Amino acid sequence: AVKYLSQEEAQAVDQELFNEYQFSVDQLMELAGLSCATAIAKAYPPTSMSKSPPTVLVICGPGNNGGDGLVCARHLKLFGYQPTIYYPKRPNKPLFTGLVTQCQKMDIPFLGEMPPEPMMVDELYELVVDAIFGFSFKGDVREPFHSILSVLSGLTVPIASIDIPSGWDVEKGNPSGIQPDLLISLTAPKKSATHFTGRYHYLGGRFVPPALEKKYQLNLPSYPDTECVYRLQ
Amino acid sequence: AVKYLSQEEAQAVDQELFNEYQFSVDQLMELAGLSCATAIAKAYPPTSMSKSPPTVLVICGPGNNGGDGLVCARHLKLFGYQPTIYYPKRPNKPLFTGLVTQCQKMDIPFLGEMPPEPMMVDELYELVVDAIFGFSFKGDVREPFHSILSVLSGLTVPIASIDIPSGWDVEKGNPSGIQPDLLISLTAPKKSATHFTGRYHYLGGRFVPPALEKKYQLNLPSYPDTECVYRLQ
Numbered sequence: 001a002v003k004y005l006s007q008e009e010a011q012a013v014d015q016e017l018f019n020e021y022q023f024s025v026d027q028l029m030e031l032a033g034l035s036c037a038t039a040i041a042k043a044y045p046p047t048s049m050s051k052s053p054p055t056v057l058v059i060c061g062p063g064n065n066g067g068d069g070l071v072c073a074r075h076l077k078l079f080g081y082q083p084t085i086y087y088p089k090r091p092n093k094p095l096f097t098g099l100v101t102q103c104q105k106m107d108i109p110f111l112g113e114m115p116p117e118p119m120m121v122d123e124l125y126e127l128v129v130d131a132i133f134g135f136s137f138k139g140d141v142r143e144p145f146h147s148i149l150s151v152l153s154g155l156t157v158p159i160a161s162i163d164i165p166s167g168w169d170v171e172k173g174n175p176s177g178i179q180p181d182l183l184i185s186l187t188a189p190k191k192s193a194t195h196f197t198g199r200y201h202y203l204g205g206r207f208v209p210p211a212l213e214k215k216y217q218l219n220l221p222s223y224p225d226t227e228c229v230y231r232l233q
Numbered sequence: 234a235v236k237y238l239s240q241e242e243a244q245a246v247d248q249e250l251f252n253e254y255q256f257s258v259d260q261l262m263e264l265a266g267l268s269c270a271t272a273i274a275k276a277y278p279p280t281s282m283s284k285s286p287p288t289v290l291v292i293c294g295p296g297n298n299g300g301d302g303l304v305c306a307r308h309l310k311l312f313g314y315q316p317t318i319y320y321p322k323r324p325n326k327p328l329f330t331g332l333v334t335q336c337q338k339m340d341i342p343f344l345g346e347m348p349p350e351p352m353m354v355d356e357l358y359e360l361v362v363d364a365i366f367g368f369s370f371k372g373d374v375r376e377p378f379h380s381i382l383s384v385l386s387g388l389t390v391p392i393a394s395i396d397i398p399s400g401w402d403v404e405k406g407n408p409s410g411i412q413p414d415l416l417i418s419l420t421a422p423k424k425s426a427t428h429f430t431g432r433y434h435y436l437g438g439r440f441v442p443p444a445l446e447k448k449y450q451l452n453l454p455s456y457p458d459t460e461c462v463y464r465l466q
C-alpha cells in the first residue's frame with residue numbers, strides 16, 4: 001500500500017523537489033492547487049449541488065498551504081463553482097500578490113471577515129476548503145486561526161482539507177479537531193491521514209519523479225490515464 | 234463558434250495575462266505543457282500503440298514553445314510514455330535550465346543530434362512532438378531548424394504540434410511545410426489553424442479568465458468536467 005509520511009520525511013521530499021529536482025515553487029503550487037480543485041469537483045460535482053453555480057468558501061492560511069488554496073479557488077471557478085476567499089494573513093511576496101490579483105480579476109471575492117457563526121457559513125457556502133495549515137505546521141494555533149477553526153468545527157456543510165486538516169498534529173491527528181469530509185493528500189499522505197474519518201481521501205500532486213518515489217519507497221498508486229488525482233482506499 | 238486569433242490579438246491576450254492578470258510565466262507554461270501531454274495521451278493512448286511503453290521524440294525550440302515541450306515531455310513520462318528530447322538551442326535563463334534539470338531527473342534522455350533520416354525517426358519513435366516555434370515566430374527559419382523541419386516533413390509517424398505547426402506562418406499557414414496529425418492550440422486557436430489538415434485539433438491552456446474571454450470575444454468552448462483539453466471539430 002501507499003506510504004504515510006512522517007513530518008521529517010515530507011520536509012525532506014519537499015526539500016529535494018526544490019533543490020535536486022529544481023522545481024519552482026510557482027510550478028508545484030500550481031499543480032497542487034489544480035489537484036485540489038480537481039478532487040473537489042470530482043467528489044462534489046456541480047451537478048450534485050442545490051445551488052447553481054455551487055458556492056464554496058476557501059480559507060487560506062499564512063503560508064504555502066494558503067497559496068494552494070488560492071490556486072484551488074480559481075481553478076474551481078474554471079470548473080464551474082462560485083468561490084469566495086477568506087485570506088486574513090497574506091505574506092508580502094510577489095508569489096502571493098500575483099495569486100491574489102489573479103483571483104481578484106476572476107471576480108472572486110476576498111471577504112473582509114470570517115462569518116462568525118457556523119450557521120451563517122452553512123447558509124452562504126455549500127462547501128468549505130481548509131487551506132489554513134500544511135505539512136510543516138508545528139502546533140501553535142494563534143488568532144485568528146483558532147477562531148476560524150472553532151467556527152469550522154460547528155459546520156454542517158462539508159470541509160475539504162488540503163494536505164492535512166488544519167489544527168491536526170501532522171502525525172497524530174486531533175479527535176477534538178475539525179473533521180473534514182474530504183482530504184487531499186499532496187504527493188503522499190502524512191501519518192495523520194490514518195486518523196482521517198471522512199468519506200473522501202484523494203491523492204494529488206502528480207509530479208513525483210520515479211527516482212524520488214523509489215528512494216523514499218512511497219509506493220504511489222497508479223493514477224488513471226491523465227488524471228491528476230487518485231481516490232484512495 | 235470559437236475565435237481564431239490574429240498574431241496581434243494573440244500577443245495582446247498573452248500580454249494581458251502576464252500584465253493585468255499577473256500570471257507568472259511558470260504557471261501558464263506548466264498548465265500549457267500539461268494540456269499538451271494530456272491531448273497527446275488522449276489522441277494516442279498508450280494501449281493504442283504498438284510498443285510498450287510507447288516512444289515519443291520531443292523537439293524543443295529556442296524560446297517559449299520549446300519550454301512547453303519540456304513540460305510536455307515530463308508529463309508524458311508520468312502518463313506512461315517513454316519520451317526522448319532533442320533541444321539543440323537552449324536559452325541561458327533559469328526558466329529553461331530548471332525545466333531541463335526536471336526532465337533529466339525524470340530520467341528522460343536528451344539526444345546529442347537529430348537522427349538524419351526520416352526512416353530512422355519512424356523506426357525509433359512512434360510519435361514526434363513539434364515544440365520548435367510558437368505564436369510569436371516571424372518568418373525566419375535558420376539552422377539547425379530548417380534541417381530538422383526537412384526531416385519532419387518526410388516522416389510516416391504522426392507529428393503533434395504545440396500551438397502552431399513550426400514553419401507555418403502564424404496566420405497564413407504554409408502549403409509546403411510540415412503537416413501535423415495533432416495540433417494543440419493553447420488558449421485560443423490562431424488563424425493558421427484554419428489550414429490544419431490533421432485528424433486531431435485540441436484546445437488547451439484552461440486558464441483563460443471569463444472577463445478576458447468576454448473582452449476578446451474568444452467564444453471559448455466548454456471544457457468538459459475537470460479536463461484541461463477540449464477536442465475541436
Ligand SMILES: Cc1cn([C@H]2C[C@H](O)[C@@H](CO)O2)c(=O)[nH]c1=O
Pocket residue numbers: 009010011013014025028029030032064065068134135163186187188205
Ligand atoms: C512532500 C510534500 C510536498 N508538498 C509540496 C506540494 C506543494 O507545492 C506545496 C504544498 O503547499 O509543497 C506538499 O504539499 N506536501 C508534501 O507532503
Ligand SMILES: Cc1cn([C@H]2C[C@H](O)[C@@H](CO)O2)c(=O)[nH]c1=O
Pocket residue numbers: 242243244246247258261262263265297298301367368396419420421423438
Ligand atoms: C495567447 C497565447 C498565449 N500562450 C501562452 C501559453 C504559454 O504559457 C506561453 C507560451 O506558449 O504563452 C500561447 O502559447 N499561445 C497563445 O496564443
